Write a protein that binds this ligand. Structure first.
Ligand SMILES: Nc1ncnc2c1ncn2[C@@H]1O[C@H](CO)[C@@H](O)[C@H]1O
Length: 262
């Protein structure tokens, strides 16, 4: 249990969330309620999902001062987020749940999130194409949202003191930017190519053909056929996986899905 104890980083997170009294905020983790209090002050209402019932006295004290806090006791990975009406998410995330929670939240949808991650995880999220930290996580996030690191957060800001830095990350979903033909196929396509990130897209797809439910020979012939559709496709699939931009991977998988359909 890491608790964010530096009010200055609370402030930075809240300021970045651009809150008004029309906003409804989901917070993951109660902690000592320091972030919770700031959210309650500035938002219409705050939902807090907290797993540890020993923290109830913090919740209880807060609810005496604020009438717009609702506590949900449970695991945030299990809570049905469809049943909650919020537009923003602000949280010092338990790092253990970083990846699954991020995608469950984006799936549900929101206007804006400002979330604490471990610094290396944050770097991967925001990494530019063709760089050393660019990978599946980068494309999976950036294809669905604009993301940026607001601030690096030192271990001294938490208690107990962590081993590594954290980072505040701002996430603005953008449902219109890249346009995805089929989410399931896109997820499988991403999983296949990034299993071989230093190979050409062509070779990655053949090596990991079973992820897309084709055999290796089938996949070879498919890609021979696919490459002959246009010159843009040829140059994309011949390029190393990690060098393709998010835009290019989305378009490529879109064109590939339709090719496989037709
Ligand atoms: N899976 C989880 N769901 C909800 N809250 C959690 C989970 N794991 C840890 N927490 C809580 O989040 C906070 C981490 O800062 C702590 O209050 C901790 O109890």
């Amino acid at each position: 249990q890491c608790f964010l104890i530096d009010k200055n980083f609370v402030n930075k997170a809240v300021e970045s969330a651009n809150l008004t009294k029309d906003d409804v905020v989901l917070e993951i983790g109660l902690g000592k309620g320091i972030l919770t209090e700031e959210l309650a002050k500035n938002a219409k209402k705050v939902y807090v999902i907290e797993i540890d019932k020993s923290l109830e006295p913090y919740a209880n004290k807060l609810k005496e001062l604020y009438n717009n806090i609702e506590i949900i006791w449970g695991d945030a990975l299990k809570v049905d987020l469809n049943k909650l009406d919020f537009n923003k998410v602000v949280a010092n995330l338990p790092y253990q749940i970083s990846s699954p929670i991020t995608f469950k939240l984006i799936k549900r949808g929101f206007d804006l999130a400002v979330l604490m991650y471990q610094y290396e995880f944050a770097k991967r999220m925001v990494a530019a194409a063709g760089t050393k930290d660019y990978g599946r996580l980068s494309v999976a996030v950036q294809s669905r949202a604009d993301v940026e690191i607001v601030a690096k957060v030192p271990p001294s800001a938490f208690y107990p003191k962590p081993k590594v830095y954290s980072a505040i990350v701002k996430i603005k979903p953008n449902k219109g930017k890249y346009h995805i033909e089929n989410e399931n196929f896109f997820d499988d396509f991403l999983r296949a190519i990034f299993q071989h990130r230093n190979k050409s897209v062509r070779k990655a797809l053949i090596d990991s053909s079973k992820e897309l439910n084709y055999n290796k020979d089938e996949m070879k012939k498919i890609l021979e056929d696919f490459l002959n559709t246009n010159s843009e496709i040829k140059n994309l699939i011949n390029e190393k996986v990690f060098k393709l931009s998010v835009k290019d991977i989305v378009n490529l998988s879109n064109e590939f899905y339709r090719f496989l359909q037709n």
